[PDB]
Design a protein around this ligand. Sequence first.
Ligand SMILES: CN(C)c1ncc(Cl)c(Nc2ccc3c(c2)CC(=O)N3)n1
Ligand SMILES: CN(C)c1ncc(Cl)c(Nc2ccc3c(c2)CC(=O)N3)n1
Ligand SMILES: [Cl-]
Ligand SMILES: [Cl-]
Lengths: 4, 4, 123, 123
Amino acid sequence: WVIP
Amino acid sequence: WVIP
Amino acid sequence: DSCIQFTRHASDVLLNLNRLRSRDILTDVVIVVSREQFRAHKTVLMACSGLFYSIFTDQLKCNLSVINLDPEINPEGFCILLDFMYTSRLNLREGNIMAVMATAMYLQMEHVVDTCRKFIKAS
Amino acid sequence: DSCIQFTRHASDVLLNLNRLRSRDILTDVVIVVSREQFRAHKTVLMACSGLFYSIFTDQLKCNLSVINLDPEINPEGFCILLDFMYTSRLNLREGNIMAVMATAMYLQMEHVVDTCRKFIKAS
Ligand SMILES: CN(C)c1ncc(Cl)c(Nc2ccc3c(c2)CC(=O)N3)n1
Ligand SMILES: CN(C)c1ncc(Cl)c(Nc2ccc3c(c2)CC(=O)N3)n1
Ligand SMILES: [Cl-]
Ligand SMILES: [Cl-]
C-alpha cells in the first residue's frame, strides 16, 4: 500500500 | 514497454 | 517466453472498466445492501472478492441478476470497497475503518483486511 | 482525496480475468477470425480495443454473441493480441510482427501499433  |  | 510487456496496460484496463461502470455499460448484476443498490460487472466482482468468486462460479447463482448481501453489511462500507475494486484506491478513514474491515472480511478481500488490521493496531 | 493505493491491484485483477478466460467462465462473446473461434469477455475487449469499444457501445451490436472480423485478419495475429489484452505481454517476433501490427491497427490498439512501428524502424 502507498500514498498515490 | 519493458523486458519482464 | 521472449515477450515484451506494457507497464501501464493493467491500470489502463481497470480505468476503462471503471468508465464502463460509471456509464452503466454492460453491467450484468445489482448488489443489494439494505435499501441501497449497486450495479457492477460480475467478472470484476469475482476478480476482487473471494465471496463473489464463489457465488458466480456456482451453476445456479451465476445466472442471477440480483444478489442480496447479509443485512449486517453497511452500504457505505460496500460502496468504498466497490470503488477500490474498480480503482485500486481505498478511502479508509477513522469513521469508516470498522465498517470497511467487517465488509472486506465478509467479501473475502484479504489485502484490504490486512491494511485495516495494521491501521487499527497503530491507533 | 486522502485514499491509500494497493500497487498490485490492477495486475491481480487482470491475472484473475485471464484465469476466468482460460476456464471459459462468464465469457459472453465468440470472435470469429477466418475458420478460428476465440471466446472472451466483452468488457475486457472494450477496455483494450477502440474497435470493440465502438462495436459493443452500439445499441444493436452490444447484444450479439458472435462477431466476425474482416477476412484479411490473420488468426495468429489476433491470438497474440488477445493474449496481450489479458496479460500485458506481447509475443512479438520477426515472423509475426507484420500480422500483429496490421491486426493492432484494425483493432485500434494504439500502444501495440506504436511498439511495432519502432521495432520495424530499428530493423
Ligand atoms: C483462486 N482462483 C483460481 C481464482 N480464479 C479466478 C478468480 Cl476471478 C478468482 N478470484 C478470487 C478468489 C479469491 C480471492 C480473491 C479473488 C480476492 C481475495 O482476497 N480472495 N480466483
Ligand atoms: C474513450 N472512452 C471514454 C472509453 N471508455 C471506456 C472504454 Cl472501455 C474505452 N476503451 C477504448 C477506447 C479506445 C481505445 C482503447 C480502449 C484502446 C486504444 O488504443 N483506443 N474507452
Ligand atoms: Cl483485496
Ligand atoms: Cl494497446
